[PDB]
Amino acid sequence: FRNQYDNDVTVWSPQGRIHQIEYAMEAVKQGSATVGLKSKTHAVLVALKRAQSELAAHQKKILHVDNHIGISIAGLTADARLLCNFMRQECLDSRFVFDRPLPVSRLVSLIGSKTQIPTQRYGRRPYGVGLLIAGYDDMGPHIFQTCPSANYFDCRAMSIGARSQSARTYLERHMSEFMECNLNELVKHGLRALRETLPAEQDLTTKNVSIGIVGKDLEFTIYDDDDVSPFLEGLEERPQ
Template sequence: MSESQGNRFPFYGPQGRLVLVDSALEAVNRGSTTIGIKTPDFAVIASQIKPTHPLMEPSEKIFPVDFHIGATGAGYIGDILQLIDTLRLESQKHRLTYETPIDVDSLAKHLSSFLHNYTTYAVRPQAASIIISGDDQTGIQLYQVDPSGTFFRGSGFAIGQSSDTALDVITKGYNKNMNLEQAIELGRAAIEKALGEKPIVETGIIEPGKAFRKIRTDNS
């Protein structure tokens, strides 16, 4: 590729930031408000169900990945679905190869590498951030993976529209000894505060030794 052709794809901006990744993060910030909360006894992931045409089925926002893992995301729905399929495929490959369920850390690192590869070429990065929750031999786990491939492990995350507001609610209301109902309510409150309205929320739940499950609740 000539120098003139290379200049058509500016990887780095004046401040040394990856321009295409910043654009992907902007798309994430316009997505549905989405949260994750973890305690030693369970993890909850939840996302706003945005209104659609009255004749259309609402979009699925919480996705089972394996028996012991679930995920959600914010950003372009097409990119979210591709990344969910990537997680499912890696989980299935691990089961077939090793005859054991994949651990959550390995799955998050695989997605991190997958996303990072998009940042090393002049192609559009995946415009989605993913929150992964699961139960493995190390206990209940919660990860966030961003379009750059950066990943975090923690007890509370928020992505999507007004995520800073939602994360503030989670941070102030978090207690590692809270019960499942309190965590679900905290997640709903965080999404409601971020949006300034009572939305429909889809929630996924993982508990030790139990299958990942999800519920949908109208907050009105």
């Protein structure tokens, strides 16, 4: 087997790749799609909730870590949850020692440092969770996407997960309004993005969508079926 080079993260391919890292990268492609948008003063995280069966609740994909910073997970439940407790502990430690919120860029930098150790050292499996980070700090809203290759990017938007290329090309079609949009406009743009991800037979129902919005004065608040109801009342109809 020529793929004896993908059994641990500590071996390189003959062509200079770490195939285990690439498999971890592709792992988050399995999870459900999730797209985020940010305005002049407001950043939104909208995700597509999934359920094991219709007789049970949908899997939460938007996680609250601190009043100003919020995360969205796509990938392994275990790794994402561990990253979430790590995020909460670090945000609290920052609030305790500096009395200031953890910067989005600094938080994502420590996330990268934490998740690089499994990539570099034998032992812990690489953190195979795609994280969408949306928060607020001195220069306004930020959207940070932390790829499971222990890499992160400052993005205007990103959709990570299953069939996320459709949302990616939707946002590629629709940059020109993201910067100047208000809450409702950006929310409807994100909903159209997920609807692009979602196939024809399915639609963004109340139980299907999860919306998280942060801003300058508005904390990272996550909406649910009853809470997403006013935001989806302004939503248009699917252009089918």
